[PDB]
Amino acid sequence: APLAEKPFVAFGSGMESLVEATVGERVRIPAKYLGYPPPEIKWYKNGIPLESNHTIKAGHVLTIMEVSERDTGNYTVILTNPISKEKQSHVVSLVVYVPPQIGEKSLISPVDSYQYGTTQTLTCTVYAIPPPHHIHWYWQLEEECANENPYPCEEWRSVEDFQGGNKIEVNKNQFALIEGKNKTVSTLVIQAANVSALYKCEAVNKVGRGERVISFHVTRHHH
């Protein structure tokens, strides 16, 4: 304690200044204090004072029960000594990561059938924070999978390993501003549908992966 021993307030030495979390988890940011009597605490997000409700508790530990992407921001905590009114403050940057989200539904419950010979484009609209560091396409012959997420295929083939499937090309990524966010639009072109298959796009980023399975069943309607 300080040589002059009088009521005081200070932060504990271990205070973080960056905190990382993933969408959905509980976040805890402790305001560690030294001094006497126990200080009064107040939290601010980007300068706006926080009040406690069922979503967030702003006490000695700032607790966000289920962090969301909109919770990213700079949190300032101000400690006040209740006797002397001396104050200390500390800023914590909270960054909320998002594992890759694919907009198109992965639902094979009705199976998509295509006429023999047609050209079709499969698409994956991918959002992740940080952005995905790769987006890969995979495929499999329909016979080696189930139809009935039933993890339909036990093995997947890279679209580089295209022998025996449909003629396919992966287009360059495009980008779209959706819900205010830069989303990556990944497209696979099936040139002439002659082989029944399942296709999968997979996105990976720092905190997770996401995938979408697409059924590509081929039939020849006649007359």
Partner 1 sequence: HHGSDLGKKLLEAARAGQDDEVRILMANGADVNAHDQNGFTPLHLAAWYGHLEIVGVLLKNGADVNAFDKYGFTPLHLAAEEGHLEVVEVLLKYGADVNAKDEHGSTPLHLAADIGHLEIVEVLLKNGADVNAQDKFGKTAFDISIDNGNEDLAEILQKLN
Ligand X SMILES: OC[C@H]1O[C@H](O[C@H]2O[C@H](CO)[C@@H](O)[C@H](O)[C@H]2O)[C@H](O)[C@@H](O)[C@@H]1O
Ligand Y SMILES: *[C@@H]1O[C@H](CO)[C@@H](O[C@@H]2O[C@H](CO)[C@@H](O)[C@H](O)[C@H]2NC(C)=O)[C@H](O)[C@H]1NC(C)=O
Ligand Z SMILES: C[As](C)(=O)[O-]
Q: Which does 110 bind (CB under 5 to 8 A by kind): ligand Z, ligand X, partner 1, none?
A: none
Residue 28 near ligand X by CB under 6 A: yes
Q: Which does 55 bind (CB under 5 to 8 A by kind): Ca ion, partner 1, ligand Y, none?
A: ligand Y
Residue 45 near ligand Y by CB under 6 A: yes
Residue 167 near ligand X by CB under 6 A: no
Q: Which residue from 70, 76, 39, 42 is spatially nearest to 55, judged by alpha carbons?
A: 70
DSSP string spanning 113-170? EEETT--EEEEEEEEEESPPSEEEEEEEEGGGB-------BSS-EETTS-TTS--EEE
CB of 33 to ligand Y, least distance (A): 20
Interface residue with ligand X among 27, 56, 98, 124 (CB under 6 A) is 27
CB of 73 to ligand Y, least distance (A): 4
Q: Which is nearer to ligand Y, 84 or 174 (CB)?
A: 174
Interface residue with ligand Y among 15, 23, 42, 73 (CB under 6 A) is 73
Q: Which does 207 bind (CB under 5 to 8 A by kind): ligand X, partner 1, Ca ion, none?
A: none
Q: Strand ranges (DSSP E) for the chain?
A: 8-11, 18-22, 27-30, 33-36, 40-45, 48-49, 56-58, 61-64, 73-80, 87-102, 113-115, 120-129, 134-141, 157-158, 168-170, 174-178, 181-190, 197-205, 208-219
Residue 98 near ligand Y by CB under 6 A: no
CB of 6 to ligand X, least distance (A): 30
